[PDB]
Design a protein around this ligand. Sequence first.
Ligand SMILES: O=C(O)c1cccc(N2CCCC2=O)c1
Lengths: 336, 333
Amino acid sequence: HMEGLAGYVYKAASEGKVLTLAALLLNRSESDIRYLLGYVSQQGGQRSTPLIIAARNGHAKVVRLLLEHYRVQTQQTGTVRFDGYVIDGATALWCAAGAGHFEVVKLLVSHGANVNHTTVTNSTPLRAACFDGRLDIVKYLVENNANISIANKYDNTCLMIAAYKGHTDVVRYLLEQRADPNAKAHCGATALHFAAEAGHIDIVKELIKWRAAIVVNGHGMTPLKVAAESCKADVVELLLSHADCDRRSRIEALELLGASFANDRENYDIIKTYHYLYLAMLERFQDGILEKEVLPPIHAYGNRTECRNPQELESIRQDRDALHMEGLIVRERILG
Amino acid sequence: MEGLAGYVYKAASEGKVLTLAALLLNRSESDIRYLLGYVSQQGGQRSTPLIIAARNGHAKVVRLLLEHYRVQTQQTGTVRFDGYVIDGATALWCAAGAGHFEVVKLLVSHGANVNHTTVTNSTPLRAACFDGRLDIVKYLVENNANISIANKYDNTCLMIAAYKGHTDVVRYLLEQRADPNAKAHCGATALHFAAEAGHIDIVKELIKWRAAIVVNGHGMTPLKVAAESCKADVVELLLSHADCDRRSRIEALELLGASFANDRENYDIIKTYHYLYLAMLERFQILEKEVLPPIHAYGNRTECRNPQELESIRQDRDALHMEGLIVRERILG
Ligand SMILES: O=C(O)c1cccc(N2CCCC2=O)c1
């Protein structure tokens, strides 16, 4: 009937042929013009409206024709796809931000757009632009009354996703706008925990100098311990040069960091394991003396027991197999 | 003192056979049994002249040290390979390790023990499998090196080659009856090593040669180890055989998809859902699942127990990563 025409207006919008879009919509009743601009055509795992697809693909001319000459609500939600990650309940603003379509962000926001739109997971345009990495958009959004405080259904601040993806500049920016770095998440992790495991030493720098607290996650691990389990030596080194619980927890990191340099088969080093392990054993016995309760010998680790004194560690130096078995026997005790 | 044994050493290490033949000529018989039997300590290593020469492929020195100066092959020493410090290594072991097939032939042709045991029981054949030079491995076997000799923890020559990914020598070993159902102290077989790595061509040979599916000391099949290590190729190749009707199949599929979100080196949440939904589709074809309690670490979320539940989180980046650890925390521990 007329449904086919709406598929034709979708094409012109999605593809960006403003010339075609005009020829389709002109000489039509306002009632019909709304049905055409507001029919959820589904293509390529993406349920969207002409405006939403024209803003996710980034066809500013079509966006203007749909906003400056035609009246769109700038609030039509759609199920959009981003690199496999599928997002539902997103408006053209969110899709534009995620795609870094700054020109559309100007057009959309300045032509009216809830800068604090909430997807079904509460993802505000700010989160999408942070998860992307375009600082240029982020500032314009917040400087146009966006809220850096609004999180997601699991309480993930825009800072947290910025730390994860490793966008140092935008991390500093949100911190400049007083984005509290001590907000927690459902897991229990803070933005520090994220940038730590991801080896984002640049972001860990701008975090500590901004009241970044040493919180503990739901896995009983400080940001340091996460970085240790994640073979990010640089962070562990820097985090040690701070308010690190001396001994008990300081040695545990080195005992963990080295162990991680074995359990990998992709970043393994083994020599970096003996180094980080023997170093700890020395400190655990530096003066006195902080001993270790070794778990009983198990089969998976060759009915072998963890070295408990510095001399034993020096004996397995000439034993490739034992240095491997050690890294995992140490890990089992530290992590569970 | 006799730092002259130090100059004699530098010649052998550097292969300067002319300097060496000069130092050693006009030496009394007692003087040559001292100079060559001397154990110099050079850079995290301890060796005799013959040990460092065969270690370094200086066959001009090895031939002089062998043909004209009757030297014992059995001279053991403490050699080093990329941080790994091996003790009790004879010159033959050092040649097979460093891939010096010329020096290997010289040492063997002159009667060196082709079955020497390192202080930790490394056979000269193990060094060659570690190194992958099929030329040496084939040569050592034809001169009666025993394939059965494994190290202090029963690491077959077939295993270390299956681990290091030398398909060409793995084939050769099993061609020489090398047992594919070996088993180490850690309970692993040669199949577990090849499955952890992405070594499909080796895993192919092992199941060509009817490798047995065993459970290592850690409660893992080669299928589970592969899925635990995000080696989906090996998982699907292995699943083209016999596994516990649904139960083991689903387990690997569940664990494989969960590891894709975990593995920060191969992150693919699209692949995670694909393998996780396929399990719930192969479950509810009934094999229900015993979900573990909601834990703070995982946002006090509970594992999806029905296909509809999984379908609900597909447009939810966060819950997909969270589900991953939740699935591993159950399947592995
Ligand atoms: O046989 C072993 O236990 C063993 C242990 C450590 C290193 C090595 N090798 C020999 C060849 C190259 C290399 O790293 C062998």
